[PDB]
């Protein structure tokens, strides 16, 4: 239940720090906005917010939402890269547009890269995502 | 045998023969040229190929063939007639580089198979087969 971690509003070390939060942007009340926004976290004896990473809810915003957001964005980047790499193979001049990127193909790969997990599941169930161990270069033992 | 040759006009350097040349072995290169030109010694600096036939001494075989490569390439008269010898301090001379009289990159009859394996390099025995013996897996 994390009795050692108190909420930052009830913690009497966070309230001493929260007066002297510096402004980060040009907004004059940015320190006060940070102070009110970090009060819902858990603070230790230092008076600083802590993040609990075990997938629980009311602390899913620490890791689960940023983690799923990164997984979507990184899957977007990797899937668009893999799609471009596959698309530039079977047209007999691949190093030149590996080094000088074909922009009209890359734009069509990028803007249609939002549906990366559906295409990933389709290629996984279709077997066209993973190359079989026979048709692949392997170093000598 | 006895190496009839005159030395190129060289000013003398510090990269030449050391004490082991007169005690272990030294090497010589003799070459005939029909013109007088300037060459670079592996010893260091530049010397003069005088008209006629030349004899130089070096401490290593690699210095002699580094000179012989400079005699073959990079010269317009295209000197190939060079011979490389080894002189031991006893006095014995061994004629080394053009043994058949032809350069090794040109094939010649009378040369036998040395170091030739009638097997693929991947088809080599494992060292675990050849444990505790003098034989190594490339034999």
């Amino acid at each position: 239940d994390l009795s050692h971690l108190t909420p930052c509003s009830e913690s009497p070390a966070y309230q001493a720090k929260a007066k002297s939060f510096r402004n980060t942007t040009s907004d004059p009340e940015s320190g006060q906005k940070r102070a009110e926004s970090y009060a819902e976290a858990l603070c230790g004896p230092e008076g600083y917010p802590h993040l609990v990473v075990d997938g629980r809810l009311d602390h899913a915003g620490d890791f689960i939402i940023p983690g799923l957001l990164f997984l979507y964005v990184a899957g977007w980047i990797g899937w668009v890269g893999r799609s471009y790499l596959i698309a530039i193979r079977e047209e007999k001049d691949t190093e030149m547009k590996e080094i000088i990127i074909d922009v009209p193909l890359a734009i069509n790969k990028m803007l249609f890269g939002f549906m990366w997990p559906l295409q990933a599941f389709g290629e996984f169930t279709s077997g066209k995502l993973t190359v079989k161990d026979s048709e692949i270069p392997v170093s000598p033992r | 045998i006895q190496l009839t040759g005159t030395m190129p006009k060289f000013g003398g350097s510090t990269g030449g023969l050391l004490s082991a040349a007169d005690r272990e072995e030294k090497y010589a290169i003799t070459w005939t040229s029909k013109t007088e030109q300037v060459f670079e010694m592996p010893t260091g600096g530049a010397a003069i190929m005088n008209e006629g036939e030349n004899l130089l001494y070096f401490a290593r075989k690699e210095q002699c063939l580094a000179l012989g490569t400079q005699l073959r390439t990079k010269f317009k008269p295209k000197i190939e007639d060079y011979k490389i010898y080894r002189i031991y301090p006893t006095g014995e001379t061994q004629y080394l580089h053009p043994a058949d009289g032809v350069f090794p990159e040109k094939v010649n009859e009378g040369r036998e198979f040395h170091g030739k394996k009638d097997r693929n390099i991947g088809k080599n025995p494992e060292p675990v087969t050849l444990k505790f013996s003098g034989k190594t897996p490339y034999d």
Binding site: - | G12, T14, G16, T43, F58, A59
Partner: protein, 160 residues
């Protein structure tokens, strides 16, 4: 006029510069105990050891842990004796391994044939021992007997 020539053989890796072999360095290197014509070993070693033992009582006598103490000259003598003994052990084992004929250069066209054998280098080592002990003791006696000798005040005021 080329004052820097070869030694007579250009393809040998050396040059006959004024410092190397001109007129005054061929002599005085051929006239040192090593490379002198008439000396035997245990005489070359005697001269070399005497010079070395005499010079080595300079950075031990006034430069040591005891140099502010009256035992300082005696400790410098003992340190010189110890260094001469270590160098004699080094010479003895160098000979006992087995020596070759010494390197002939432009400065020294003739090297001592008597130092090309193990027996000659043993005589050289014994002469070095006796010479080093004698030179160290002579320098100790000279530095100690006036008990101040203000030449030692020079280069100890420098090495304060």
């Amino acid at each position: 006029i080329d004052v820097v020539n070869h030694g007579g053989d250009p393809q040998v890796g050396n040059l006959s510069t004024p410092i190397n072999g001109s007129a005054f360095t061929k002599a005085f290197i051929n006239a040192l105990p090593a490379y002198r014509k008439g000396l035997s070993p245990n005489r070359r070693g005697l001269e070399v050891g005497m010079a070395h033992g005499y010079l080595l009582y300079g950075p031990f006598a006034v430069l040591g842990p005891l140099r502010l103490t009256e035992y300082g000259p005696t400790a410098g003598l003992l340190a010189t004796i110890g260094l001469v003994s270590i160098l004699t052990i080094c010479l003895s084992i160098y000979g006992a391994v087995g020596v070759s004929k010494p390197t002939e250069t432009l400065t020294t066209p003739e090297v001592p044939m008597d130092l090309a054998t193990k027996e000659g280098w043993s005589e050289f080592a014994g002469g070095f021992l006796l010479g080093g002990c004698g030179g160290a003791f002579f320098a100790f006696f000279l530095c100690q007997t006036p008990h101040l000798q203000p030449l030692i005040e020079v280069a100890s005021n420098i090495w304060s």
